[PDB]
Design a protein around this nucleic acid. Structure first.
Ligand SMILES: [K+]
Ligand SMILES: [Mg+2]
Ligand SMILES: [Mg+2]
Ligand SMILES: [Mg+2]
Ligand SMILES: [Mg+2]
Lengths: 95, 48, 52, 31, 49, 354, 74, 143, 92
RNA sequence: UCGGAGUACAAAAAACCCUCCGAGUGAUUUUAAUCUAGACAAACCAGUCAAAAUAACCAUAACAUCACUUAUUGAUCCAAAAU
């Protein structure tokens, strides 16, 4: 991670994170299971179903990815016909 | 402060003992209530 | 004895393929799978050889 | 469990005989 | 919010309302750079409109 | 730290040594019969019957009923055997029995079953359905005298009411008829009650029919106390149980405190407690018969609330408890994307300052 | 531990509760499935005075199936 | 207002068979390692002693509801022998009538594999089917 | 329902036969919806539901039938109670 | 690298260039679906079970089996094939 770039002096981002993660506005990150396209005939029906499901990331991983990406990707976006648009905000969270 | 603790501890043990005695009487008084609340068994005693 | 992995295409016209392990000395295999596209059991035949 | 009074309630191997299986190499009418 | 703006005089129904009047009324903020194509109307307060 | 068992071990009676001498089971059906007999004993360890509601185990049932008829076993033993030998010697019966071609007079068996073991079989039917629990609590009675209740539905069709049957309210719109064998030397009392169906109180039961001082068999000639009312179960909660109770009384008892008005339609006046009712007149009356049927909702119930009871029809519904979910964590770990949908309050999107 | 009342059994011999309630452990008799040749053979050779005993896991239900509520009074 | 219109918000039904007849009561699912499975409301228990034939209908609590056996004097005097194939038919027909009288229309029968092919049991169930009693209890709603 | 003159006479009576469970004591047909939070959508659902009730009742040839799990036991419990009803003797 | 037994005596975990057995796949047909409550396990990545519901077929049918059954296996990127 380049904290200070040599051209503008701002903070750069890691393009590896954005190509394989989705950030909801609540802070939660979204990812695909590892190995969901490798050797499907070998795995059982239940195992294939589990590997094809989106999963969340814990606090340390979520905190790690927030320091690897700039503030542009944490903004609030209103996409047209976005399937994840209803998951952006948390609700009924009693902490 | 020590004296008040002695009084407090002595009363709780005495109060706890009284509660157990009340429950024992309550259990016995409840048992006789069931006997004095059912119906007169006619059964085979009608022909006896 | 080595087995062969072949891909079987549905005979119902829909595009649905699942791989099955088959013995090499055996001839062409034909099974009765259940493709969700038609929601009914249809005939499946061996089409291609992928992995040994 | 060991310490429980109901230990060994499922004991059955002492009711039936050992019934030694007829091994392929040990198959012999030992009378 | 559209009802809220009218009651406080932020915008007026006598004059036609378009995107420009909403911006001058501080109702919504549009950033053309961030791939914004305008304002979409939602039905959150359709009952009390 | 081994402990000493609190009682005898199950398989300690048999000798471990000399296995060949002990005879084996040799069958699987013998083990099941032996296992089931062993499963009903009161073992000192924890058993399935202890935790799964054996209804307080052994209960000292209080018997309040007519004494059993006096029958001589010595004479009965000889006559029963003598009758069997005549049937045994019939060659034609052996011809049919061997060729697996014979039938029995089921109607004849029904008549004799009622006289011989009918009272005992009906006793456990009432206990299974909890009639005694909701009427006399722990007390129980044996239906010594047979009782028959039938409903006139068509021109000649007759719907019977047996123990634990199911009768539609349409068949029960009209008053039924009761037939039982009794000499003209005593009095009888008939009571029909709705055990479940009371609205305000859950521990009370309604009364649909009550006839006092019935002279012998003729029910109609007896004094009438509460007029007949068709069953009115709620549309939601179905299968209400209605029980016919027959009481035998020694003397003419003054049943005037329980008198109801002739056009009685106030359900507040139909509140009844059989245990309380039987408490007052325990000395005179004695239960002798029983017959109960199930009853669900139908179209004929609707007119009862409107025309007869002048009441808006109440409708219930079976409501299950809401599903259980764990406490929501701020950062769900390895959970599907649908984890947020479980705790969503409404599927309609809600906007804030926007 | 063999499964008991309101307790399932997975393909990997794990016990999972089927109804919400209190877990209880119990020693009961064992009557094997007749189609299981190995188990029925063991029962056959037992002496007449003996019965197999096994431990079981039960879940006594706590919440009732449901309740009736007034939804409309027409 | 109208004193007759007072209705409690929650209605309590004390009839034990109300949930069973609505197919909403809980079946004791589970076991699997033992036999017979105890997932039923009513079970038909047929016992063939060397002298008498006894058929039972049992609830899951262990109680017996309706029983029809050759040991009864009512059925004994009408049968030639209590240990025939005809005797099982008489037991089946008598129990079938009593079950209808008792309101029990559904029950579960789990026969032993060799008893399922036995001549008496095969024709015993035939009497039950024509007697009005139907096996294969209805599936629980929201099981 | 009786005074609703925007529906035909055969249609008006068929609604009472099929939807007699929703008919109030005073003859007031009651329809209720609880789907959406906005009352505009709730009212729209009721009107659309009312159209479907009238449309299927309006057609004389519209008489669909279906078989359900509860129907099987309903027929059996109805068939069983007819076994006891077959006796025909003089009644009260 | 992966599994079983002892060391690790009774919930779990627990080491050594410690003591002994194995696995890097076959045989067969019952060719084993979609969707979702709740949990075991775990640093992470991974692994496991699973009611209800829908479809399939006795027209109210989901555990592929056997060989100590437990191990019979490989992440991204990238490449090839119909997608
Ligand atoms: K009630
Ligand atoms: Mg913006
Ligand atoms: Mg854990
Ligand atoms: Mg299922
Ligand atoms: Mg790389």
């Amino acid at each position: 991670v380049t904290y200070f770039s040599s051209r503008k002096g701002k903070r750069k981002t890691v393009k590896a994170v954005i190509y394989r993660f989705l950030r909801l506005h609540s802070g939660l990150w979204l990812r695909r299971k590892a190995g969901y396209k490798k050797k499907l005939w070998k795995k059982t029906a239940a195992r294939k179903r589990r590997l094809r499901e989106f999963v969340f990331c814990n606090k340390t991983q979520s905190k790690l990815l927030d320091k690897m990406t700039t503030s542009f990707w944490k903004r609030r976006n209103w996409y047209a016909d976005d399937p994840y648009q209803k998951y952006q905000d948390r609700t009924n969270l009693k902490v | 402060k020590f004296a008040r603790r002695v009084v407090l501890l002595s009363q709780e043990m005495d109060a706890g003992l009284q509660a157990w005695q009340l429950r024992q009487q309550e259990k016995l008084q409840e048992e006789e209530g069931k006997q004095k609340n059912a119906l007169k068994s006619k059964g085979a005693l009608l022909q006896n | 004895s080595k087995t062969i992995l072949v891909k079987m295409m549905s005979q119902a016209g829909t595009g649905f393929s699942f791989n099955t392990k088959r013995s090499r000395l055996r001839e062409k295999l034909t099974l009765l799978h259940y493709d969700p596209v038609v929601k009914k059991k249809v005939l499946f035949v061996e089409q291609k050889k992928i992995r040994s | 469990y060991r310490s429980k009074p109901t230990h060994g309630i499922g004991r059955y191997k002492h009711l039936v005989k050992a019934q030694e299986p007829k091994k392929k190499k040990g198959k012999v009418e030992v009378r | 919010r559209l009802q809220y703006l009218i009651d406080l005089g932020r915008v007026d129904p006598t004059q036609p309302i378009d995107l420009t009047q909403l911006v001058n009324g501080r109702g919504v903020t549009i950033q053309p750079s961030k791939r914004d194509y305008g304002v979409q109307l939602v039905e959150e307060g359709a009952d009390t409109f | 730290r081994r402990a000493a068992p609190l009682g005898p071990m199950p398989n300690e009676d048999i000798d471990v040594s000399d296995l060949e001498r002990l005879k084996k089971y040799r069958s699987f059906d013998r083990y099941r019969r032996r296992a089931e007999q062993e499963a009903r004993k009161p073992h000192w360890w924890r058993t399935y019957r202890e935790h799964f509601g054996e209804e307080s185990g052994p209960k000292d049932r209080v018997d309040i009923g007519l004494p059993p008829p006096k029958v001589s076993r010595t004479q009965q033993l000889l006559e029963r055997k003598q009758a069997l030998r005549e049937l045994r010697a019939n060659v034609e019966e052996e011809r049919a029995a061997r060729l697996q071609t014979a039938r029995i007079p089921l109607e004849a068996v029904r008549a004799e079953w009622e006289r011989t073991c009918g009272p005992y079989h009906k006793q456990r039917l009432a206990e299974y359905c909890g009639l005694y629990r909701d009427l006399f609590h722990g007390a129980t009675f044996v239906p010594r005298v047979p009782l028959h209740v039938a409903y006139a539905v068509g021109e000649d069709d007759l719907m019977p009411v047996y123990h634990g049957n199911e009768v539609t309210p349409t068949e029960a719109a009209q008053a039924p008829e009761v037939t039982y064998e009794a000499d003209e030397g005593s009095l009888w009392t008939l009571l029909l009650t709705n055990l479940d169906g009371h609205l305000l109180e859950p521990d009370a039961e309604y009364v649909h029919w009550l006839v006092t001082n019935i002279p012998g068999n003729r029910v109609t000639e007896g004094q009438e106390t509460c007029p007949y009312l068709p069953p009115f179960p709620a549309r939601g909660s179905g299968f209400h149980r209605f029980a016919f109770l027959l009481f035998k009384q020694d003397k003419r008892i003054d049943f005037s405190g329980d008198t109801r008005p002739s056009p009685c339609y106030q359900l507040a006046q139909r509140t009844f407690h059989t245990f309380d009712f039987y408490k007052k007149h325990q000395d005179a009356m004695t239960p002798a018969g029983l017959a109960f049927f199930q009853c669900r909702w139908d179209d004929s119930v609707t007119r009862v609330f409107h025309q007869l009871l002048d009441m808006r029809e109440p409708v219930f519904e079976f409501v299950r408890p809401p599903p259980y979910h764990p406490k929501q964590k701020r950062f769900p770990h390895r959970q599907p994307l649908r984890y947020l949908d479980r705790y969503r309050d409404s599927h309609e999107p809600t906007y804030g300052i926007y | 531990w063999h499964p008991g009342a309101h307790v399932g059994l997975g393909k990997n011999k794990c016990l999972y509760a089927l109804e919400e309630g209190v877990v209880r452990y119990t020693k009961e008799v064992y009557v094997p499935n007749p189609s299981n040749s190995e188990a029925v053979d063991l029962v056959t050779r037992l002496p007449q005075g003996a019965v197999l005993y096994k431990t079981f896991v039960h879940v006594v239900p706590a919440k009732p199936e449901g309740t009736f509520k007034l939804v409309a009074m027409l | 207002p109208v004193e007759n219109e007072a209705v409690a918000p929650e209605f309590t039904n004390r009839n034990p068979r109300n949930l069973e007849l609505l197919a909403v009561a809980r079946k004791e699912r589970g076991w699997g390692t033992v036999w017979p499975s105890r997932e039923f409301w009513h079970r038909l228990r047929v016992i063939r002693t060397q002298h008498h034939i006894e058929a039972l209908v049992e609830h899951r609590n262990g109680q017996v509801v309706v029983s029809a056996s050759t040991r009864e004097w009512a059925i004994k005097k009408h049968l030639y022998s209590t240990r025939n194939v005809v005797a099982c038919e008489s037991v089946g027909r008598v129990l079938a009538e009593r079950c209808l009288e008792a309101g029990i229309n559904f029950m579960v029968y789990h026969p032993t594999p060799w008893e399922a092919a036995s001549d008496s049991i095969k024709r015993l169930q035939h009497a039950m089917t024509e007697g009005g009693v139907v096996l294969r209890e209805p599936r629980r709603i929201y099981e | 329902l009786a005074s609703a003159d925007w529906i035909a006479e055969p249609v008006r009576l068929k609604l009472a036969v099929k939807h007699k469970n929703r008919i109030n004591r005073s003859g007031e047909l009651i329809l209720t919806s609880e789907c959406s939070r906005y009352q505009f959508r709730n009212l729209a659902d009721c009107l659309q539901k009312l159209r479907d009730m009238i449309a299927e009742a309006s057609q004389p040839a519209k008489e669909p039938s279906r078989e359900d799990a509860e129907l099987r036991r309903s027929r059996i419990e109805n068939m069983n109670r007819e076994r006891l009803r077959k006796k025909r003797i003089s009644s009260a």
